[PDB]
């Protein structure tokens, strides 16, 4: 397989505008949402059809109860943070947990928290400790590190349980996640040379420009890999032409183990 990942996010908002949830939690396999929960629906629900078809109602019922609890825990943790920061108004709290199964068979695991969108506490599952970015986090770090069994629990979840979930979901969604749709690549002028690719899956792609067989990333404008809306992606890269010298320009595209070169005449 290619590299794959599983991650769950949580978002807490302390004083949300009317209608918007104080708490949301979404799971992803790669770029695919698989699960959602929020404080308005109070239900955990699938976000991919291959999750709904392979997880029995007992699964959604049980994690719905756990997420009702995690929602309350997030409210209490955010209240404590905003009091220690002495902050008024609406502030955000975020959590991300997950793991990766690399192509070569190795694994990574990660867990971190953010306050107002900035890193706040970052877990190191090898040294079994929390990295704190300021003195509010330093206070939380001491409290969390006092509970050694919970650090051990998180290391086991990240290294064993998460990877097991990931391989289970990869099998459920294999027709989606393990397919390959090659890009359709074209070049035009607008003076700058544009190289445009669309129709591809997975979204991981590398497009670059070479001049006389040499690459120079400083001279290249790299566009983002964007969702096309139909399950595939598109990207582009541009480079400006030198009218003072004759040079051979070529677009190079790398996708899922295939390399492609488009020579500009």
């Amino acid at each position, epitope marked *: 397989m290619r590299t794959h990942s599983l991650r769950y996010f949580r978002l807490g908002v302390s004083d949300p505008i009317h209608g918007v949830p104080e708490f949301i939690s979404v799971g992803y396999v790669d770029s695919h949402p698989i699960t959602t929960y929020d404080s308005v629906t109070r239900q955990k629900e699938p976000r991919a059809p291959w999750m709904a078809e392979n997880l029995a109602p007992d699964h959604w019922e049980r994690y719905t109860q756990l997420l009702r*609890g995690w929602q*309350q825990m997030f409210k209490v943790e955010l209240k404590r943070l905003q009091r220690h920061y002495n902050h008024s108004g609406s502030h955000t709290y975020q959590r991300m947990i997950g793991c990766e199964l690399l192509e070569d068979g190795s694994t990574t695991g990660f867990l971190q928290y953010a306050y107002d969108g900035q890193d706040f506490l970052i877990f190191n599952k090898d040294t079994l400790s929390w990295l704190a970015v300021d003195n509010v986090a330093h206070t939380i770090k001491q409290a969390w590190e006092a509970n050694q069994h919970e650090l051990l629990y998180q290391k*086991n979840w990240l290294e064993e349980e998460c990877i097991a979930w990931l391989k289970r979901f990869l099998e459920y969604g294999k027709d989606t996640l393990q397919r390959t749709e090659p890009p359709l690549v074209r070049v035009n002028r607008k003076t700058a040379l544009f190289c445009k690719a669309h129709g591809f899956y997975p979204p991981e792609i590398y497009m670059t420009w070479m001049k006389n067989g040499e690459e120079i990333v400083q001279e290249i404008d790299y566009g983002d890999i964007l969702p096309s809306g139909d399950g595939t992606y598109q990207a582009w890269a541009s480079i400006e032409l030198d009218p003072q010298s004759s040079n051979l320009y070529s677009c190079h595209v790398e996708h899922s183990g295939v390399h492609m070169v488009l020579q500009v005449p």
Partner: antibody, heavy 108, light 115 residues
Framework: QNIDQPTEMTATEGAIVQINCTYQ??????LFWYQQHAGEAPTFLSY??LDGLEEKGRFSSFLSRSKGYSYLLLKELQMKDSASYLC??????????WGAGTKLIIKP | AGVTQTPKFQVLKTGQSMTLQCAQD?????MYWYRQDPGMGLRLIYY???????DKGEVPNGYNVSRLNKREFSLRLESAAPSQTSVYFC??????????????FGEGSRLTVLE
């Protein structure tokens, strides 16, 4: 999902006894041991989630995740150790599966 | 006080109603009702992962529960049956969706239901 531990064990005061617990579960989020004196409430003894041995006073608890095996080790047995010992495992959905308990009888 | 459940003992005729009370003063979020029967491990009847939510356990038939507030979780036998003769334990923990946190048990309620 299944947890197994012997029904009853008898050892002598001052000696050592090892209470075994084997489990097969859908995933693993830790193994607990509880003590329950006859007619009383269970109380927490130990938690293991990574492999190896952990010590707490006269009690130690061992876990092997690959073997799906734990033991609770009681040394220098006293009459007050006569009780039932319950093993419990949290599975992938954080549900506790409970063993039926081992009744430990101590001979003075 | 920890976990306080009542009553310690109760005799019931088949069809009679009964409510078991449980309160915890440890500011725990999660509460549980178990039954204990000889020859088997503890079986969860209902649980309450947080204030304002409850759900069935493994043996919910014949029972209902009410999480009245953060402290209190009562168990109701609307129409007692002999099969509900058992010892009942209420328990609480700080949270449910975590790994290492232990349970704290009440003293137990011994119920005998007779025809």
């Amino acid at each position: 999902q299944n947890i197994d531990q012997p029904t009853e064990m008898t050892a002598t005061e001052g000696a050592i006894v090892q209470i075994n617990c084997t489990y097969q579960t859908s995933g693993f989020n830790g193994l607990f041991w509880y003590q329950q004196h006859a007619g009383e409430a269970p109380t927490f003894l130990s938690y293991n989630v990574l492999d190896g041995l952990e010590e707490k006073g006269r009690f130690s608890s061992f876990l092997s995740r690959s073997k799906g095996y734990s033991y609770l080790l009681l040394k220098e047995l006293q009459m007050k150790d006569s009780a039932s010992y319950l093993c419990a495992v949290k599975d992938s959905n954080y549900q506790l599966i409970w063993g039926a308990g081992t009744k430990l009888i101590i001979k003075p | 006080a920890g976990v306080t459940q009542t009553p310690k003992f109760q005799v019931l005729k088949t069809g009679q109603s009964m409510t078991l009370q449980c309160a915890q003063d440890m500011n725990h979020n999660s509460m549980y009702w178990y039954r204990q029967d000889p020859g088997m491990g503890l079986r969860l009847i209902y649980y309450s992962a947080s204030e304002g939510t409850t759900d069935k356990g493994e043996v919910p038939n014949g029972y209902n529960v009410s999480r009245l507030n953060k402290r209190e979780f009562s168990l109701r036998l609307e129409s007692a049956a002999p099969s509900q003769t058992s010892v009942y334990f209420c328990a609480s923990s700080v949270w449910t969706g975590e790994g290492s946190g232990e349970l704290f048990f009440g003293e137990g309620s011994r119920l005998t239901v007779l025809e």
